[PDB]
Amino acid sequence: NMFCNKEYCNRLKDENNCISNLQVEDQGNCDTSWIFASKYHLETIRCMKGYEPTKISALYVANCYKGEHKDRCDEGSSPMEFLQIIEDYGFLPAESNYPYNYVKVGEQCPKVEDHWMNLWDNGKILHGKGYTAYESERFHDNMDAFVKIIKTEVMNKGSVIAYIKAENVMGYEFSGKKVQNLCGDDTADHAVNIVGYGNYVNSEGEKKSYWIVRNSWGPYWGDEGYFKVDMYGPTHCHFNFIHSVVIFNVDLPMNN
């Protein structure tokens, strides 16, 4: 029965889980997947510490940053910057306080109002970079260990951040109802989250396994905004579909 063990993890099937209540979002026509995937990883980390499934304001992160003005719609950033933004501001408003519209990416950072809730209240970034990252290509000859690392973090933190090449999921007949059997590229350009996994039997009757991946292209794309992808992919791939994974090292007290 249980919804997240070492062989099978799918919290989406449990309407009672905090994580299942974090609805899929749409980044729109800006390069802001770095914000969606990073804030979702924090949102699941919060769920695991007993907090409400309250959405972080992606627009606040897009619009509030130190230094010279940047083109926050045309230029993607990284999860390292999500953390840099937290550490500079110490405030993450709820989505409801400052809701996302992609055409507003670029607006002046809004003044925090008294009635805004702080979704990072009492949060600490652990020492020494604040995150841990892994490259699939560095595990080409111990893919098992890579899989194990990701499974453990999905179990414990509720998700990891993963980087993929967006083109790899733009196959002309991409169907969210199928486990995709995909290759990756030498590089990546789009942040997603791995949120679960399980085993399946493929079209050749072979035992295989899949990641469940959350995207930020709205709930119409894929399978209600998610898709399944084979952990290994075609034998011939030089590069795994999952290029990199990033995990945040955050200390949040058990509360709310």
Query: Measured at the alpha carbon of residue 34, what is the angle toward residues 176 and 108, in degrees to the nearest 5?
Result: 125
Of the candidate spans 49-57, 94-102, 149-157, 178-186, the one that interacts with ligand 2HP by CB under 6 A turns out to be 178-186
Per CB under 6 A, 190 contacts ligand 2HP: yes
Of positions 109, 149, 155, 237, contacts ligand 2HP by CB under 6 A: 237
What's the rounded Cα separation, in Å, for the pair 71 and 105? 9
The one catalytic residue among 41, 190, 193, 243: 190
Give the contact letters, 178-207, x = binds to K ion (CB under 5 A), - = no: -----x-x----------------------
What's the rounded Cα separation, in Å, for the pair 169 and 182? 8
Per CB under 6 A, 76 contacts ligand 2HP: yes
Any catalytic annotation for residue 190?
A: yes
Of the candidate spans 28-36, 46-54, 126-134, 219-227, the one that interacts with ligand 2HP by CB under 6 A turns out to be 28-36
Of positions 48, 94, 155, 183, contacts ligand 2HP by CB under 6 A: 183
Q: Which residue has the tokens 């098992």?
A: 144
What's the rounded Cα separation, in Å, for the pair 199 and 231? 10
Per CB under 6 A, 80 contacts ligand 2HP: no
3-class SS at 152? helix
Picking from 34, 108, 103, the residue whose alpha carbon sits closest to that of residue 64 is 108
Of positions 229, 239, 243, 250, contacts ligand 2HP by CB under 6 A: 239
Q: How far is CA 52 from CA 43, 47, 65, 122, in A?
A: 9, 6, 26, 15
Distance of alpha carbon 147 from the chain centroid: 16
**Smallest separation (angstroms) from K ion to the CB of 208:** 19
Interface positions, 35-64, toward ligand 2HP (CB under 6 A): none
The two beta strands, 190-201 and 207-214, are: antiparallel
Q: Where does this chain bind K ion (CB under 5 A)?
A: 183, 185
> What residues line the site for ligand 2HP (CB under 6 A)?
27, 31-33, 76, 166, 183-185, 189-190, 236-239
- Among all residues, which ones are annotated catalytic? 190, 215
